[PDB]
PDB file of C-alpha atoms and ligand atoms in Angstrom:
ATOM      1  CA  UNK A   3      34.215 -56.084  47.434  1.00  0.00           C
ATOM      2  CA  UNK A   4      36.929 -53.475  48.097  1.00  0.00           C
ATOM      3  CA  UNK A   5      34.350 -50.691  48.585  1.00  0.00           C
ATOM      4  CA  UNK A   6      33.033 -52.267  51.897  1.00  0.00           C
ATOM      5  CA  UNK A   7      34.961 -53.471  55.042  1.00  0.00           C
ATOM      6  CA  UNK A   8      33.327 -55.050  58.164  1.00  0.00           C
ATOM      7  CA  UNK A   9      34.327 -53.253  61.419  1.00  0.00           C
ATOM      8  CA  UNK A  10      32.009 -55.376  63.684  1.00  0.00           C
ATOM      9  CA  UNK A  11      29.992 -58.654  63.312  1.00  0.00           C
ATOM     10  CA  UNK A  12      27.546 -59.045  66.281  1.00  0.00           C
ATOM     11  CA  UNK A  13      27.070 -62.377  68.069  1.00  0.00           C
ATOM     12  CA  UNK A  14      23.877 -64.291  68.923  1.00  0.00           C
ATOM     13  CA  UNK A  15      22.075 -63.395  65.641  1.00  0.00           C
ATOM     14  CA  UNK A  16      22.372 -59.659  66.580  1.00  0.00           C
ATOM     15  CA  UNK A  17      22.298 -57.453  69.714  1.00  0.00           C
ATOM     16  CA  UNK A  18      19.195 -55.842  71.263  1.00  0.00           C
ATOM     17  CA  UNK A  19      19.261 -52.244  72.621  1.00  0.00           C
ATOM     18  CA  UNK A  20      19.505 -53.431  76.296  1.00  0.00           C
ATOM     19  CA  UNK A  21      22.935 -55.123  75.607  1.00  0.00           C
ATOM     20  CA  UNK A  22      24.752 -52.027  74.205  1.00  0.00           C
ATOM     21  CA  UNK A  23      26.628 -49.243  76.110  1.00  0.00           C
ATOM     22  CA  UNK A  24      27.786 -45.943  74.526  1.00  0.00           C
ATOM     23  CA  UNK A  25      30.572 -43.597  75.704  1.00  0.00           C
ATOM     24  CA  UNK A  26      29.919 -40.115  74.120  1.00  0.00           C
ATOM     25  CA  UNK A  27      33.203 -38.140  74.740  1.00  0.00           C
ATOM     26  CA  UNK A  28      35.074 -35.184  73.109  1.00  0.00           C
ATOM     27  CA  UNK A  29      38.128 -37.606  73.193  1.00  0.00           C
ATOM     28  CA  UNK A  30      36.230 -39.404  70.316  1.00  0.00           C
ATOM     29  CA  UNK A  31      36.004 -36.240  68.125  1.00  0.00           C
ATOM     30  CA  UNK A  32      37.864 -35.529  64.845  1.00  0.00           C
ATOM     31  CA  UNK A  33      41.288 -33.867  65.428  1.00  0.00           C
ATOM     32  CA  UNK A  34      41.704 -30.300  64.062  1.00  0.00           C
ATOM     33  CA  UNK A  35      43.284 -30.351  60.516  1.00  0.00           C
ATOM     34  CA  UNK A  36      47.112 -29.847  60.377  1.00  0.00           C
ATOM     35  CA  UNK A  37      46.903 -26.430  58.590  1.00  0.00           C
ATOM     36  CA  UNK A  38      43.735 -25.521  60.549  1.00  0.00           C
ATOM     37  CA  UNK A  39      39.923 -26.057  60.206  1.00  0.00           C
ATOM     38  CA  UNK A  40      39.840 -22.871  57.968  1.00  0.00           C
ATOM     39  CA  UNK A  41      39.993 -25.272  54.925  1.00  0.00           C
ATOM     40  CA  UNK A  42      36.577 -26.754  56.046  1.00  0.00           C
ATOM     41  CA  UNK A  43      35.074 -23.246  56.546  1.00  0.00           C
ATOM     42  CA  UNK A  44      36.270 -22.217  52.996  1.00  0.00           C
ATOM     43  CA  UNK A  45      34.610 -25.281  51.260  1.00  0.00           C
ATOM     44  CA  UNK A  46      31.354 -24.557  53.247  1.00  0.00           C
ATOM     45  CA  UNK A  47      31.356 -20.827  52.233  1.00  0.00           C
ATOM     46  CA  UNK A  48      31.859 -21.774  48.543  1.00  0.00           C
ATOM     47  CA  UNK A  49      28.931 -24.283  48.847  1.00  0.00           C
ATOM     48  CA  UNK A  50      26.490 -21.839  50.620  1.00  0.00           C
ATOM     49  CA  UNK A  51      27.298 -19.071  48.076  1.00  0.00           C
ATOM     50  CA  UNK A  52      25.878 -21.429  45.332  1.00  0.00           C
ATOM     51  CA  UNK A  53      23.135 -23.196  47.405  1.00  0.00           C
ATOM     52  CA  UNK A  54      22.148 -20.716  50.200  1.00  0.00           C
ATOM     53  CA  UNK A  55      19.132 -22.930  51.282  1.00  0.00           C
ATOM     54  CA  UNK A  56      21.523 -25.659  52.650  1.00  0.00           C
ATOM     55  CA  UNK A  57      21.801 -25.984  56.469  1.00  0.00           C
ATOM     56  CA  UNK A  58      24.360 -27.629  58.806  1.00  0.00           C
ATOM     57  CA  UNK A  59      23.240 -30.359  61.284  1.00  0.00           C
ATOM     58  CA  UNK A  60      25.053 -32.229  64.097  1.00  0.00           C
ATOM     59  CA  UNK A  61      25.864 -35.949  63.618  1.00  0.00           C
ATOM     60  CA  UNK A  62      27.334 -38.778  65.741  1.00  0.00           C
ATOM     61  CA  UNK A  63      30.985 -39.680  64.964  1.00  0.00           C
ATOM     62  CA  UNK A  64      32.101 -43.356  65.263  1.00  0.00           C
ATOM     63  CA  UNK A  65      35.544 -43.655  66.956  1.00  0.00           C
ATOM     64  CA  UNK A  66      35.523 -47.448  67.658  1.00  0.00           C
ATOM     65  CA  UNK A  67      33.341 -50.365  68.870  1.00  0.00           C
ATOM     66  CA  UNK A  68      34.610 -53.107  71.279  1.00  0.00           C
ATOM     67  CA  UNK A  69      32.723 -56.434  71.678  1.00  0.00           C
ATOM     68  CA  UNK A  70      32.766 -58.302  75.051  1.00  0.00           C
ATOM     69  CA  UNK A  71      34.226 -61.850  75.187  1.00  0.00           C
ATOM     70  CA  UNK A  72      31.615 -64.111  73.410  1.00  0.00           C
ATOM     71  CA  UNK A  73      29.135 -65.993  75.640  1.00  0.00           C
ATOM     72  CA  UNK A  74      29.606 -63.511  78.573  1.00  0.00           C
ATOM     73  CA  UNK A  75      26.930 -62.022  80.913  1.00  0.00           C
ATOM     74  CA  UNK A  76      26.322 -58.255  81.100  1.00  0.00           C
ATOM     75  CA  UNK A  77      26.720 -55.585  78.374  1.00  0.00           C
ATOM     76  CA  UNK A  78      28.055 -57.057  75.108  1.00  0.00           C
ATOM     77  CA  UNK A  79      29.189 -53.956  73.128  1.00  0.00           C
ATOM     78  CA  UNK A  80      30.790 -50.555  73.913  1.00  0.00           C
ATOM     79  CA  UNK A  81      30.298 -47.873  71.181  1.00  0.00           C
ATOM     80  CA  UNK A  82      32.830 -45.020  71.475  1.00  0.00           C
ATOM     81  CA  UNK A  83      31.131 -41.947  69.899  1.00  0.00           C
ATOM     82  CA  UNK A  84      32.043 -38.277  69.341  1.00  0.00           C
ATOM     83  CA  UNK A  85      30.186 -35.397  67.650  1.00  0.00           C
ATOM     84  CA  UNK A  86      30.606 -34.100  64.075  1.00  0.00           C
ATOM     85  CA  UNK A  87      28.460 -32.264  61.467  1.00  0.00           C
ATOM     86  CA  UNK A  88      27.305 -32.254  57.816  1.00  0.00           C
ATOM     87  CA  UNK A  89      29.704 -29.240  57.273  1.00  0.00           C
ATOM     88  CA  UNK A  90      32.685 -31.207  58.623  1.00  0.00           C
ATOM     89  CA  UNK A  91      31.697 -34.209  56.398  1.00  0.00           C
ATOM     90  CA  UNK A  92      31.663 -31.939  53.263  1.00  0.00           C
ATOM     91  CA  UNK A  93      35.152 -30.592  54.120  1.00  0.00           C
ATOM     92  CA  UNK A  94      36.806 -34.014  54.941  1.00  0.00           C
ATOM     93  CA  UNK A  95      35.257 -37.366  53.734  1.00  0.00           C
ATOM     94  CA  UNK A  96      33.582 -35.701  50.647  1.00  0.00           C
ATOM     95  CA  UNK A  97      36.734 -33.591  49.783  1.00  0.00           C
ATOM     96  CA  UNK A  98      38.835 -34.474  46.697  1.00  0.00           C
ATOM     97  CA  UNK A  99      41.823 -34.526  49.169  1.00  0.00           C
ATOM     98  CA  UNK A 100      40.237 -37.141  51.561  1.00  0.00           C
ATOM     99  CA  UNK A 101      43.024 -39.742  50.772  1.00  0.00           C
ATOM    100  CA  UNK A 102      45.715 -37.102  51.705  1.00  0.00           C
ATOM    101  CA  UNK A 103      43.877 -36.574  55.091  1.00  0.00           C
ATOM    102  CA  UNK A 104      43.927 -40.412  55.714  1.00  0.00           C
ATOM    103  CA  UNK A 105      47.733 -40.581  54.990  1.00  0.00           C
ATOM    104  CA  UNK A 106      48.371 -37.531  57.316  1.00  0.00           C
ATOM    105  CA  UNK A 107      46.253 -39.177  60.079  1.00  0.00           C
ATOM    106  CA  UNK A 108      48.403 -42.387  59.832  1.00  0.00           C
ATOM    107  CA  UNK A 109      51.602 -40.209  60.052  1.00  0.00           C
ATOM    108  CA  UNK A 110      50.540 -37.855  62.929  1.00  0.00           C
ATOM    109  CA  UNK A 111      48.189 -40.088  65.063  1.00  0.00           C
ATOM    110  CA  UNK A 112      48.633 -43.745  63.834  1.00  0.00           C
ATOM    111  CA  UNK A 113      44.914 -43.422  62.844  1.00  0.00           C
ATOM    112  CA  UNK A 114      43.811 -43.169  59.152  1.00  0.00           C
ATOM    113  CA  UNK A 115      40.466 -41.623  60.387  1.00  0.00           C
ATOM    114  CA  UNK A 116      41.941 -38.974  62.821  1.00  0.00           C
ATOM    115  CA  UNK A 117      41.259 -35.996  60.422  1.00  0.00           C
ATOM    116  CA  UNK A 118      37.888 -37.366  59.029  1.00  0.00           C
ATOM    117  CA  UNK A 119      34.358 -36.333  60.218  1.00  0.00           C
ATOM    118  CA  UNK A 120      33.174 -39.996  59.859  1.00  0.00           C
ATOM    119  CA  UNK A 121      29.425 -39.383  60.590  1.00  0.00           C
ATOM    120  CA  UNK A 122      27.638 -42.596  61.774  1.00  0.00           C
ATOM    121  CA  UNK A 123      24.949 -43.888  59.374  1.00  0.00           C
ATOM    122  CA  UNK A 124      22.141 -46.397  60.118  1.00  0.00           C
ATOM    123  CA  UNK A 125      20.644 -48.945  57.655  1.00  0.00           C
ATOM    124  CA  UNK A 126      18.181 -51.852  57.862  1.00  0.00           C
ATOM    125  CA  UNK A 127      17.741 -55.311  56.404  1.00  0.00           C
ATOM    126  CA  UNK A 128      13.936 -54.954  56.578  1.00  0.00           C
ATOM    127  CA  UNK A 129      12.134 -58.355  56.176  1.00  0.00           C
ATOM    128  CA  UNK A 130       8.397 -58.777  55.270  1.00  0.00           C
ATOM    129  CA  UNK A 131       5.934 -61.304  56.805  1.00  0.00           C
ATOM    130  CA  UNK A 132       6.224 -63.355  53.491  1.00  0.00           C
ATOM    131  CA  UNK A 133      10.090 -63.516  53.731  1.00  0.00           C
ATOM    132  CA  UNK A 134      11.379 -60.788  51.328  1.00  0.00           C
ATOM    133  CA  UNK A 135      13.953 -58.004  52.027  1.00  0.00           C
ATOM    134  CA  UNK A 136      13.031 -54.389  51.017  1.00  0.00           C
ATOM    135  CA  UNK A 137      15.174 -52.381  48.468  1.00  0.00           C
ATOM    136  CA  UNK A 138      14.865 -48.699  47.297  1.00  0.00           C
ATOM    137  CA  UNK A 139      16.085 -47.066  44.017  1.00  0.00           C
ATOM    138  CA  UNK A 140      18.018 -43.769  44.507  1.00  0.00           C
ATOM    139  CA  UNK A 141      17.204 -40.711  42.302  1.00  0.00           C
ATOM    140  CA  UNK A 142      19.714 -40.193  39.393  1.00  0.00           C
ATOM    141  CA  UNK A 143      19.834 -36.464  40.497  1.00  0.00           C
ATOM    142  CA  UNK A 144      21.283 -36.808  44.101  1.00  0.00           C
ATOM    143  CA  UNK A 145      24.978 -36.110  44.949  1.00  0.00           C
ATOM    144  CA  UNK A 146      26.008 -39.540  46.398  1.00  0.00           C
ATOM    145  CA  UNK A 147      25.477 -42.930  44.648  1.00  0.00           C
ATOM    146  CA  UNK A 148      23.014 -41.547  42.034  1.00  0.00           C
ATOM    147  CA  UNK A 149      20.799 -44.180  40.414  1.00  0.00           C
ATOM    148  CA  UNK A 150      22.054 -46.977  42.761  1.00  0.00           C
ATOM    149  CA  UNK A 151      20.023 -49.476  44.874  1.00  0.00           C
ATOM    150  CA  UNK A 152      19.851 -48.695  48.659  1.00  0.00           C
ATOM    151  CA  UNK A 153      18.154 -50.069  51.829  1.00  0.00           C
ATOM    152  CA  UNK A 154      16.123 -47.909  54.273  1.00  0.00           C
ATOM    153  CA  UNK A 155      18.302 -45.683  56.508  1.00  0.00           C
ATOM    154  CA  UNK A 156      19.821 -42.255  57.203  1.00  0.00           C
ATOM    155  CA  UNK A 157      22.376 -40.276  59.295  1.00  0.00           C
ATOM    156  CA  UNK A 158      20.845 -39.571  62.742  1.00  0.00           C
ATOM    157  CA  UNK A 159      21.036 -36.074  64.347  1.00  0.00           C
ATOM    158  CA  UNK A 160      21.732 -35.913  68.136  1.00  0.00           C
ATOM    159  CA  UNK A 161      18.718 -34.787  70.396  1.00  0.00           C
ATOM    160  CA  UNK A 173      26.238 -45.110  80.376  1.00  0.00           C
ATOM    161  CA  UNK A 174      24.237 -42.240  81.984  1.00  0.00           C
ATOM    162  CA  UNK A 175      23.932 -40.063  78.854  1.00  0.00           C
ATOM    163  CA  UNK A 176      25.121 -43.293  76.977  1.00  0.00           C
ATOM    164  CA  UNK A 177      21.748 -45.140  77.287  1.00  0.00           C
ATOM    165  CA  UNK A 178      19.835 -42.150  75.801  1.00  0.00           C
ATOM    166  CA  UNK A 179      22.280 -42.189  72.839  1.00  0.00           C
ATOM    167  CA  UNK A 180      21.782 -45.969  72.225  1.00  0.00           C
ATOM    168  CA  UNK A 181      17.980 -45.307  72.438  1.00  0.00           C
ATOM    169  CA  UNK A 182      18.226 -42.509  69.758  1.00  0.00           C
ATOM    170  CA  UNK A 183      20.256 -44.851  67.432  1.00  0.00           C
ATOM    171  CA  UNK A 184      17.627 -47.693  67.630  1.00  0.00           C
ATOM    172  CA  UNK A 185      14.712 -45.131  67.412  1.00  0.00           C
ATOM    173  CA  UNK A 186      16.284 -43.431  64.331  1.00  0.00           C
ATOM    174  CA  UNK A 187      16.367 -46.664  62.180  1.00  0.00           C
ATOM    175  CA  UNK A 188      12.568 -47.169  62.864  1.00  0.00           C
ATOM    176  CA  UNK A 189      11.838 -43.449  62.175  1.00  0.00           C
ATOM    177  CA  UNK A 190      13.824 -43.690  58.827  1.00  0.00           C
ATOM    178  CA  UNK A 191      11.651 -46.740  57.847  1.00  0.00           C
ATOM    179  CA  UNK A 192       8.374 -44.888  58.804  1.00  0.00           C
ATOM    180  CA  UNK A 193       9.459 -41.651  56.973  1.00  0.00           C
ATOM    181  CA  UNK A 194      10.673 -43.253  53.662  1.00  0.00           C
ATOM    182  CA  UNK A 195       8.630 -46.547  53.373  1.00  0.00           C
ATOM    183  CA  UNK A 196       5.478 -44.929  54.972  1.00  0.00           C
ATOM    184  CA  UNK A 197       4.945 -48.002  57.280  1.00  0.00           C
ATOM    185  CA  UNK A 198       3.041 -47.681  60.567  1.00  0.00           C
ATOM    186  CA  UNK A 199       5.467 -47.907  63.579  1.00  0.00           C
ATOM    187  CA  UNK A 200       3.283 -50.688  65.125  1.00  0.00           C
ATOM    188  CA  UNK A 201       4.042 -53.037  62.141  1.00  0.00           C
ATOM    189  CA  UNK A 202       7.827 -52.987  63.085  1.00  0.00           C
ATOM    190  CA  UNK A 203       9.841 -55.230  65.533  1.00  0.00           C
ATOM    191  CA  UNK A 204      12.443 -53.784  67.943  1.00  0.00           C
ATOM    192  CA  UNK A 205      15.646 -53.668  65.855  1.00  0.00           C
ATOM    193  CA  UNK A 206      18.681 -55.969  66.371  1.00  0.00           C
ATOM    194  CA  UNK A 207      22.171 -54.598  65.649  1.00  0.00           C
ATOM    195  CA  UNK A 208      23.832 -56.963  63.075  1.00  0.00           C
ATOM    196  CA  UNK A 209      27.190 -55.112  62.858  1.00  0.00           C
ATOM    197  CA  UNK A 210      29.049 -52.030  61.528  1.00  0.00           C
ATOM    198  CA  UNK A 211      30.269 -51.610  57.898  1.00  0.00           C
ATOM    199  CA  UNK A 212      32.750 -49.020  56.456  1.00  0.00           C
ATOM    200  CA  UNK A 213      32.273 -47.297  52.996  1.00  0.00           C
ATOM    201  CA  UNK A 214      35.812 -47.197  51.505  1.00  0.00           C
ATOM    202  CA  UNK A 215      34.421 -45.063  48.572  1.00  0.00           C
ATOM    203  CA  UNK A 216      33.586 -42.317  51.162  1.00  0.00           C
ATOM    204  CA  UNK A 217      37.037 -42.345  52.954  1.00  0.00           C
ATOM    205  CA  UNK A 218      36.009 -45.039  55.461  1.00  0.00           C
ATOM    206  CA  UNK A 219      32.841 -43.569  57.112  1.00  0.00           C
ATOM    207  CA  UNK A 220      30.784 -46.262  58.961  1.00  0.00           C
ATOM    208  CA  UNK A 221      27.101 -47.320  59.185  1.00  0.00           C
ATOM    209  CA  UNK A 222      25.410 -49.383  61.943  1.00  0.00           C
ATOM    210  CA  UNK A 223      23.388 -52.117  60.117  1.00  0.00           C
ATOM    211  CA  UNK A 224      20.175 -53.453  61.812  1.00  0.00           C
ATOM    212  CA  UNK A 225      17.645 -56.320  61.226  1.00  0.00           C
ATOM    213  CA  UNK A 226      13.953 -55.224  61.449  1.00  0.00           C
ATOM    214  CA  UNK A 227      10.925 -57.514  60.878  1.00  0.00           C
ATOM    215  CA  UNK A 228       7.600 -56.137  59.507  1.00  0.00           C
ATOM    216  CA  UNK A 229       4.197 -57.831  60.159  1.00  0.00           C
ATOM    217  CA  UNK A 230       3.011 -56.787  56.627  1.00  0.00           C
ATOM    218  CA  UNK A 231       3.511 -58.782  53.386  1.00  0.00           C
ATOM    219  CA  UNK A 232       5.546 -57.450  50.402  1.00  0.00           C
ATOM    220  CA  UNK A 233       2.251 -56.460  48.617  1.00  0.00           C
ATOM    221  CA  UNK A 234       1.048 -54.495  51.728  1.00  0.00           C
ATOM    222  CA  UNK A 235       4.531 -52.771  52.135  1.00  0.00           C
ATOM    223  CA  UNK A 236       4.378 -51.718  48.421  1.00  0.00           C
ATOM    224  CA  UNK A 237       0.837 -50.276  48.888  1.00  0.00           C
ATOM    225  CA  UNK A 238       1.933 -48.143  51.933  1.00  0.00           C
ATOM    226  CA  UNK A 239       5.094 -46.857  50.091  1.00  0.00           C
ATOM    227  CA  UNK A 240       3.127 -45.862  46.928  1.00  0.00           C
ATOM    228  CA  UNK A 241       0.073 -44.317  48.724  1.00  0.00           C
ATOM    229  CA  UNK A 242       2.247 -41.428  50.038  1.00  0.00           C
ATOM    230  CA  UNK A 243       2.747 -40.284  46.401  1.00  0.00           C
ATOM    231  CA  UNK A 244       6.031 -39.006  44.863  1.00  0.00           C
ATOM    232  CA  UNK A 245       6.577 -36.252  47.569  1.00  0.00           C
ATOM    233  CA  UNK A 246       6.355 -38.783  50.473  1.00  0.00           C
ATOM    234  CA  UNK A 247       9.756 -40.454  49.592  1.00  0.00           C
ATOM    235  CA  UNK A 248      13.304 -39.425  48.423  1.00  0.00           C
ATOM    236  CA  UNK A 249      13.698 -42.787  46.523  1.00  0.00           C
ATOM    237  CA  UNK A 250      12.118 -43.312  42.998  1.00  0.00           C
ATOM    238  CA  UNK A 251      10.944 -46.940  43.476  1.00  0.00           C
ATOM    239  CA  UNK A 252      10.635 -49.951  45.904  1.00  0.00           C
ATOM    240  CA  UNK A 253      11.259 -53.659  45.152  1.00  0.00           C
ATOM    241  CA  UNK A 254      11.622 -57.017  46.996  1.00  0.00           C
ATOM    242  CA  UNK A 255      14.064 -60.021  46.885  1.00  0.00           C
ATOM    243  CA  UNK A 256      13.165 -63.388  48.551  1.00  0.00           C
ATOM    244  CA  UNK A 257      15.401 -64.038  51.636  1.00  0.00           C
ATOM    245  CA  UNK A 258      16.135 -67.401  49.858  1.00  0.00           C
ATOM    246  CA  UNK A 259      17.819 -65.407  47.003  1.00  0.00           C
ATOM    247  CA  UNK A 260      19.653 -62.798  49.201  1.00  0.00           C
ATOM    248  CA  UNK A 261      22.132 -65.629  50.045  1.00  0.00           C
ATOM    249  CA  UNK A 262      23.667 -65.483  46.474  1.00  0.00           C
ATOM    250  CA  UNK A 263      23.050 -61.725  45.775  1.00  0.00           C
ATOM    251  CA  UNK A 264      26.860 -61.036  45.431  1.00  0.00           C
ATOM    252  CA  UNK A 265      26.843 -63.406  42.360  1.00  0.00           C
ATOM    253  CA  UNK A 266      23.960 -61.474  40.622  1.00  0.00           C
ATOM    254  CA  UNK A 267      23.971 -58.419  38.234  1.00  0.00           C
ATOM    255  CA  UNK A 268      22.106 -56.533  41.065  1.00  0.00           C
ATOM    256  CA  UNK A 269      25.359 -56.486  43.166  1.00  0.00           C
ATOM    257  CA  UNK A 270      27.083 -53.946  40.785  1.00  0.00           C
ATOM    258  CA  UNK A 271      24.066 -51.573  41.315  1.00  0.00           C
ATOM    259  CA  UNK A 272      24.109 -51.679  45.216  1.00  0.00           C
ATOM    260  CA  UNK A 273      25.630 -48.680  47.055  1.00  0.00           C
ATOM    261  CA  UNK A 274      28.371 -49.635  49.597  1.00  0.00           C
ATOM    262  CA  UNK A 275      26.240 -49.166  52.795  1.00  0.00           C
ATOM    263  CA  UNK A 276      23.470 -51.413  51.304  1.00  0.00           C
ATOM    264  CA  UNK A 277      26.176 -54.036  50.432  1.00  0.00           C
ATOM    265  CA  UNK A 278      27.246 -53.837  54.140  1.00  0.00           C
ATOM    266  CA  UNK A 279      23.616 -54.464  55.263  1.00  0.00           C
ATOM    267  CA  UNK A 280      23.283 -57.566  53.011  1.00  0.00           C
ATOM    268  CA  UNK A 281      26.735 -59.070  53.912  1.00  0.00           C
ATOM    269  CA  UNK A 282      25.891 -58.688  57.658  1.00  0.00           C
ATOM    270  CA  UNK A 283      22.303 -60.112  57.157  1.00  0.00           C
ATOM    271  CA  UNK A 284      23.806 -63.172  55.343  1.00  0.00           C
ATOM    272  CA  UNK A 285      26.552 -63.742  58.066  1.00  0.00           C
ATOM    273  CA  UNK A 286      24.486 -62.977  61.255  1.00  0.00           C
ATOM    274  CA  UNK A 287      20.802 -63.893  60.457  1.00  0.00           C
ATOM    275  CA  UNK A 288      21.432 -66.318  57.519  1.00  0.00           C
ATOM    276  CA  UNK A 289      24.262 -68.941  57.880  1.00  0.00           C
ATOM    277  CA  UNK A 290      22.606 -71.431  60.314  1.00  0.00           C
ATOM    278  CA  UNK A 291      24.739 -73.106  63.094  1.00  0.00           C
ATOM    279  CA  UNK A 292      22.508 -76.079  64.208  1.00  0.00           C
ATOM    280  CA  UNK A 293      21.709 -79.559  62.743  1.00  0.00           C
ATOM    281  CA  UNK A 294      18.071 -78.813  61.591  1.00  0.00           C
ATOM    282  CA  UNK A 295      18.655 -75.595  59.507  1.00  0.00           C
ATOM    283  CA  UNK A 296      22.170 -76.874  58.478  1.00  0.00           C
ATOM    284  CA  UNK A 297      20.660 -80.075  56.900  1.00  0.00           C
ATOM    285  CA  UNK A 298      21.206 -80.185  53.050  1.00  0.00           C
ATOM    286  CA  UNK A 299      17.481 -79.891  52.054  1.00  0.00           C
ATOM    287  CA  UNK A 300      17.208 -76.607  54.138  1.00  0.00           C
ATOM    288  CA  UNK A 301      20.794 -75.325  53.342  1.00  0.00           C
ATOM    289  CA  UNK A 302      21.357 -76.194  49.673  1.00  0.00           C
ATOM    290  CA  UNK A 303      25.040 -76.927  48.789  1.00  0.00           C
ATOM    291  CA  UNK A 304      26.868 -74.245  46.647  1.00  0.00           C
TER     292      UNK A 304
HETATM  293  C1  S2Y B 401      27.192 -32.672  48.719  1.00  0.00           C
HETATM  294  O1  S2Y B 401      26.258 -32.946  49.757  1.00  0.00           O
HETATM  295  C2  S2Y B 401      25.988 -34.246  50.100  1.00  0.00           C
HETATM  296  C3  S2Y B 401      24.785 -34.495  50.740  1.00  0.00           C
HETATM  297  C4  S2Y B 401      24.460 -35.779  51.128  1.00  0.00           C
HETATM  298  C5  S2Y B 401      25.336 -36.831  50.892  1.00  0.00           C
HETATM  299  N1  S2Y B 401      25.005 -38.140  51.271  1.00  0.00           N
HETATM  300  C6  S2Y B 401      24.306 -38.508  52.500  1.00  0.00           C
HETATM  301  C7  S2Y B 401      24.960 -37.976  53.758  1.00  0.00           C
HETATM  302  C8  S2Y B 401      26.247 -38.356  54.108  1.00  0.00           C
HETATM  303  C9  S2Y B 401      26.846 -37.861  55.255  1.00  0.00           C
HETATM  304  C10 S2Y B 401      26.138 -36.991  56.041  1.00  0.00           C
HETATM  305  F1  S2Y B 401      26.711 -36.497  57.169  1.00  0.00           F
HETATM  306  C11 S2Y B 401      24.866 -36.606  55.737  1.00  0.00           C
HETATM  307  C12 S2Y B 401      24.277 -37.110  54.593  1.00  0.00           C
HETATM  308  C13 S2Y B 401      26.544 -36.573  50.260  1.00  0.00           C
HETATM  309  C14 S2Y B 401      26.870 -35.290  49.865  1.00  0.00           C
END
């Protein structure tokens, strides 16, 4: 799967909010482009002169994420974050020249991402009470990954002593994205666990934080809530469900070729962090079938 790389696999089946620190610093920002940020401004002007209803929005930038020594007390992860924007994303990661920017970043900074916006996404492996994961079909008319299968998620917009408010907004945003798109009541959702961070190599290496969320509703009840909003209540064109039993071998199915890279990241991390048992009971052959 060359279109997805794992940047972080969390320990302990996934990290809760209270175990994560963020450092939000202008040291973590994109570097100005070698010939100047005027190239980003020009692409934006061209875009707005065709689609004048578009608007810019701030985003978090991922610089790096460092895990504590395994089995340790105290905070377990440090997220190093900067600020970026939708405009900067359109002029860097989305640009036809994005690979030239990655080569220049290696040369100038020893950092393939130094000249990329790299907005931080969020996604969820959302499980039902009857042990299915939730999938969404993307419209064939959107700009990125048209017609592909996705999981719930989005690209959070901003607003350890400002750090803890940032971690709070990241965890809050994955629940809000589930409530907005799947139309689920917030009180049917568990507090999220961070499974890990995946990079989309088809979008010049931008990263998404991938979470596990449990729902107290069954697959049939989730479907009812999704559909009862009507076509204007969701950006996706359909919902569907795969048994957690069958997610284990999803990379061997015809579905895998239809999954967008960030959804592939979510399912790889679910299989490694929540699946793959470590103990004698769940590791026994009748509960963990060989092959
Ligand atoms: C041409 O416009 C596009 C609009 C949206 C997208 N994809 C989602 C998305 C990625 C990164 C973001 F920062 C914000 C949204 C790509 C291209």
